[PDB]
Amino acid sequence: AMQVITSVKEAKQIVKDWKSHQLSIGYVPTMGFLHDGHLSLVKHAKTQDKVIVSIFVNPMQFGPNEDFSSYPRDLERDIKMCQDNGVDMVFIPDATQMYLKNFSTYVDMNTITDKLCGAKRPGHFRGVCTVLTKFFNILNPDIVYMGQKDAQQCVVVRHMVDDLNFDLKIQICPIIREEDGLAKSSRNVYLSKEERKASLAISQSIFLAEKLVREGEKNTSKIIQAMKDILEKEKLIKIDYIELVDFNTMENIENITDNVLGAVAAFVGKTRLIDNFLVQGLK
């Protein structure tokens, strides 16, 4: 049996009871409208005794120029998918449970978040860090499962966890893709037929770049140009950024040594999509 919980007080009691039986807790934070990407995280979380999925379209991490109002929402779909995939609790708080009238506290940081999407989305990572601090305090998980698809987010959260001494682990999981390469995302629902066809250039640029890197290419300027050439063939695509950075610091790399995070963000029509590849432990 799976519990669908909307109350903070109630979620805390359930977690407290699990702890009293020394049960481990795996946690998958999401914004709902679930897909196979989220399910791959749940599957990893099943290594723990109990699995929690949160579904919360967090208003703090959206700006007015973004898509808070149109963000896909379908709780019936999500609940069914969690039920069918062995989730123990679905935590679906509404914003009035999470952010009371006098709420004014926040968590933020002075490194990492100023690069990539963080530079393009003022206030976004403050929203992410703040809401996850709350969820982590409420749910007291042992391992938190997050997708490599939001690479910078993984690094930001890992850093917050280290800096603030959260007694938990962040486990990063691989990007799950559609049959034709497109990284799975709830935002893919926005794409028209023509836009979806164009969006494939994003994953194609990622596939090429990773192939070049693994074949010994160290010049990031050259890799980026090769990626740009693919993307520029699609008139529906407006590049937001293409960057090859150090995976630990998010700082730009001119010449690759031990690691590289190659990240792309682009608008396909109005929809902002992201994708990346990550290579570590190069000689």
Ligand X SMILES: Nc1ncnc2c1ncn2[C@@H]1O[C@H](COP(=O)(O)O)[C@@H](O)[C@H]1O
Ligand Y SMILES: CC(C)(CO)[C@@H](O)C(=O)NCCC(=O)O
- Going by their DSSP bridges, the two strands 169-173 and 237-245 should be labelled as unpaired
44 is known as an active-site residue = no
Q: Does 110 bind a second copy (CB under 8 A)?
A: yes
Give the one entry of ligand X, a second copy, ligand Y, none that residue 149 binds, where binding means its C-beta sits below a cut-off of 5 to 8 angstroms depending on kind. Answer: ligand X
CB of 240 to ligand X, least distance (A): 17
> How many whole angstroms separate alpha carbon 203 and alpha carbon 218?
20
Which of 26, 29 has the CB closer to ligand Y? Answer: 29
CB of 102 to a second copy, least distance (A): 7
Site for ligand Y in 35-74 (CB under 6 A): 58, 61
CB of 235 to ligand Y, least distance (A): 25
Give the one entry of ligand X, a second copy, ligand Y, none that residue 112 binds, where binding means its C-beta sits below a cut-off of 5 to 8 angstroms depending on kind. Answer: a second copy
> Angle CA(129)–CA(131)–CA(134) in degrees, nearest 5?
105
Kindly list the distances between the CA atom of residue 10 and the CA atoms of 47, 82, 87, in Å, as whole numbers in the listed order. Answer: 24, 19, 17
Q: Does 150 bind ligand X (CB under 6 A)?
A: yes
Give the one entry of ligand Y, ligand X, a second copy, none that residue 128 binds, where binding means its C-beta sits below a cut-off of 5 to 8 angstroms depending on kind. Answer: ligand Y
> How many whole angstroms separate alpha carbon 204 and alpha carbon 226?
11
Take residue 205 and report the two structure tokens written for it.
Answer: 């640029």
Take residue 105 and report the two structure tokens written for it.
Answer: 């506290």
Q: Does 265 bind ligand X (CB under 6 A)?
A: no
Contact string (CB under 6 A) for ligand Y, positions 141-160, x = contact = ---------x--x-------
The catalytic position among 21, 38, 44, 159 is: 38
Among residues 124, 184, 196, 272, the one that binds ligand X under rule CB under 6 A: 184
Give the one entry of ligand X, a second copy, ligand Y, none that residue 132 binds, where binding means its C-beta sits below a cut-off of 5 to 8 angstroms depending on kind. Answer: ligand Y
Fill in the amino acid letter for 251.
Answer: E
Kindly list the distances between the CA atom of residue 110 and the CA atoms of 59, 113, 117, 160, in Å, as whole numbers in the listed order. Answer: 22, 7, 15, 11
**Residue 48, SS3 per DSSP:** coil
CB of 137 to a second copy, least distance (A): 4
Q: Does 116 bind ligand Y (CB under 6 A)?
A: no
Contact string (CB under 6 A) for ligand X, positions 7-46, x = contact = -----------------------xx-----xx-xx-----
Classify the C-alpha dihedral 186-192-195-196 as positive or negative: positive
Say if CB 187 and CB 67 are below 8 A apart: yes
Among residues 48, 133, 152, 185, the one that binds ligand X under rule CB under 6 A: 185
Take residue 152 and report the two structure tokens written for it.
Answer: 């910078």
Q: In sequence order, which residues have a C-beta less than 8 Å from that of residue 209 and are 6 or more positions away?
A: 223, 226, 227, 244, 262, 277
Say if CB 136 and CB 166 are below 8 A apart: yes
Interface contacts to ligand Y, rule CB under 6 A: 29-31, 58, 61, 128, 131-132, 150, 153
- Binding-site residue numbers for beta-alanine are 61
- Binding-site residue numbers for (R)-pantoate are 61, 153
